[PDB]
Amino acid sequence: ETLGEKWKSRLNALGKSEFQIYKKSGIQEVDRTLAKEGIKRGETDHHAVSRGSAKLRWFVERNLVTPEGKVVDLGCGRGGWSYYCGGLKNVREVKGLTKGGPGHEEPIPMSTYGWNLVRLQSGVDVFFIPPERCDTLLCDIGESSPNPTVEAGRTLRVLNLVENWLSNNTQFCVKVLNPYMSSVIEKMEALQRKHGGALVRNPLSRNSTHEMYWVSNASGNIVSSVNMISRMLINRFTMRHKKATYEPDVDLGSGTRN
Numbered sequence: 001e002t003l004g005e006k007w008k009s010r011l012n013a014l015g016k017s018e019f020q021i022y023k024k025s026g027i028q029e030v031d032r033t034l035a036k037e038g039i040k041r042g043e044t045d046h047h048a049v050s051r052g053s054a055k056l057r058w059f060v061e062r063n064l065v066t067p068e069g070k071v072v073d074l075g076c077g078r079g080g081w082s083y084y085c086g087g088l089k090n091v092r093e094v095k096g097l098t099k100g101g102p103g104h105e106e107p108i109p110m111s112t113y114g115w116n117l118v119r120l121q122s123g124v125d126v127f128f129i130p131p132e133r134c135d136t137l138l139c140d141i142g143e144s145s146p147n148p149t150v151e152a153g154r155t156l157r158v159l160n161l162v163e164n165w166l167s168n169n170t171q172f173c174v175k176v177l178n179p180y181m182s183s184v185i186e187k188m189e190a191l192q193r194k195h196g197g198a199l200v201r202n203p204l205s206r207n208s209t210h211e212m213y214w215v216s217n218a219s220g221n222i223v224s225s226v227n228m229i230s231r232m233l234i235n236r237f238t239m240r241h242k243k244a245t246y247e248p249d250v251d252l253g254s255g256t257r258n
């Protein structure tokens, strides 16, 4: 048994209203009221389609991942990671792929800066299409379960997916939903040995998930990095100024790139 699983159990034991408070406790939020209000009205212009744009922003503006070349966005959902990549100096093709359909997030068409370089496909399942060439590989897949055993298999499927997609020097950002289970640790140590990078916690993540992202330009003992987060997440159960701090939302320009 791990320090993560302790966290998981305490989390699971929470009152409905107690969990809602834990979730936002001392996190970083993104200011989305107006951007969402604009989208509801048609505006295709300056708005990130989701808070993922801001979320990826954070890794990128710190050179943890430098999208370049042909970017594949596995599970692009609405499109927040892709449209944000679309505007990035070093970037040529953005290809975003996602399930969509009833009960899943569908890609929203946007005219943001570099939109013309972004193509997003709904109706695809990625675990069952063939790997393609790419320079930057992104992946935000991993559905949360109260049962950590579940999360570990979901997380395992994902890494096993990404491997098949990766070559040498590939820029990458992958959600590892449950990095604390011992099966996931094991896989990650391998993956790191073979590919580099470390796991990093994004301050925009809620306290109710123990997600960390495997990002390419970083280093660090996996085990230790997972633990300092389980510790962090446990410490936040007992918190005494539990407001969130807010960032203004990414503004993603408009119009076309050549």
Ligand SMILES: Nc1ncnc2c1ncn2[C@@H]1O[C@H](CSCC[C@H](N)C(=O)O)[C@@H](O)[C@H]1O
Pocket: 049, 050, 051, 052, 053, 074, 075, 076, 077, 078, 079, 080, 081, 082, 097, 098, 099, 100, 104, 105, 124, 125, 126, 127, 140, 141, 142
């Ligand atoms: N096997 C699969 N194939 C394609 N899409 C999948 C998938 N499993 C999960 N997904 C999709 O992956 C998405 C990840 S969450 C979307 C976040 C996105 N980066 C953004 O910033 O908006 C979900 O919307 C889900 O529908």
